[PDB]
């Protein structure tokens, strides 16, 4: 239901997934040639089949493929700086693929929104879903849009006619947690006759 979910969520409202007490088979993921990009930092995805983690987490959203390269520790992404901050010492894997067939409409699909304004970058894995009208200066907006009174969000529109640099991409990022606690995820490789 993470990779074959029919709809995803917007980047400002990125869902928060917990994986524990189950066996993770990443071979189903990296063997399939249906994902545009496959980046893992500080960890070997092939060797993930015989390692254990205290807790494994996933995040899913849809953004532009050109914005994907922004997501990296030590780097700043225009969306990422206000939608998804990532620690420098992060360890995990990032996978993304195009969704032109399912996330593009001839008339456009404007239902997906995104955070646009804030006065400081958020902390790693910190979300902001407040709908309060952004203030561009000293004069209070008082909840009425207009000059210097900007709605905090805006939308994305996508069409099949959009090019490769314009098509939406479905993004999945995996984060692994290893506290001073027993692990909850194991691998099935050692099964034999």
């Amino acid at each position, epitope marked *: 239901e993470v990779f074959n979910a029919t709809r995803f969520a917007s980047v400002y409202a990125w869902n928060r997934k917990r994986i524990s007490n189950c066996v993770a088979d990443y071979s189903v993921l990296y063997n399939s040639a249906s994902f545009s990009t496959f980046k893992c930092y500080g960890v070997s995805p092939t060797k993930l089949n015989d390692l254990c983690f205290t807790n494994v987490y996933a995040d899913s959203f849809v953004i532009r493929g*050109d914005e994907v390269r922004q997501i990296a520790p030590g780097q*700043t992404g*225009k969306i990422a*700086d206000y939608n998804y901050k990532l620690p420098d010492d992060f360890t995990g894997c990032v996978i993304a693929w195009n969704s032109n067939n399912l996330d593009s409409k001839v008339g*456009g699909n404007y239902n997906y929104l995104y955070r*646009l304004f*804030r*006065k*400081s*970058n958020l902390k790693p894995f910190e979300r902001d879903i407040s709908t309060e009208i952004y*203030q*561009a*200066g*000293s004069t209070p907006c008082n909840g009425v849009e207009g*000059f*210097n009174c*900007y709605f905090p969000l805006q939308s994305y*529109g*996508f*069409q099949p*006619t*959009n*090019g490769v*640099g*314009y098509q939406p991409y479905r993004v999945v990022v995996l984060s692994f947690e290893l506290l001073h606690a027993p692990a909850t995820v194991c691998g099935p490789k050692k099964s034999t006759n």
Partner: antibody
Amino acid sequence: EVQLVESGGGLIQPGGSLRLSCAASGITVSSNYMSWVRQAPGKGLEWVSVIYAGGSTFYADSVKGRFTISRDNSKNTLYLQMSSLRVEDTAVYYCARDLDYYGMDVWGRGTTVTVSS
Amino acid sequence: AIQLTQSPSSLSASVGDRVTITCRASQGISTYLAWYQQKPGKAPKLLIYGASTLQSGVPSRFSGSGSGTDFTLTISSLQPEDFAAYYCQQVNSYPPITFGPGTKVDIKR
């Protein structure tokens, strides 16, 4: 009113190092996004850089090892320090303010620097 | 990268004459270009949002359209001060945003 107050440069040989500035007389600088402009005479206007409310910086290809931009909120002032100038760098340069990412609001009158013999 | 050309490179119109300026793209953008007005010795000025969204304080005589790659501008009733030059600017992505040839629109009185 809304207006931009710009520092002003001068005549400098190639490779010179200088710092400029621009204060926003319309709105508090910390509450908005802004930039500067490069305009080669009779050619056009080029994006160069921008600072973010989180302090983030972002350069153009030609200004990565050449230009640096800073801010003082108390002075309502956005700065710019240049280095490693070239002769062709002689061109009128303007200032950009972005009430929105997707456009432009108020142009500065521009500051000029000459690099010639 | 996206390459742009503005048509035409000069134009001849009278007072109130319908002036239509068009730019073309090589790649498919949806709503991320800007039409701007810049008189000589004068600063550029915001004209449109998206393709057909009016800005603040602009007379309704100014008009524009265009999507996909072919990108247009329109003046419903030409006005004497409209003697200027028109160009384009994209949104985000690379800094340069190259455009087409220079243009001179001439008023007929």
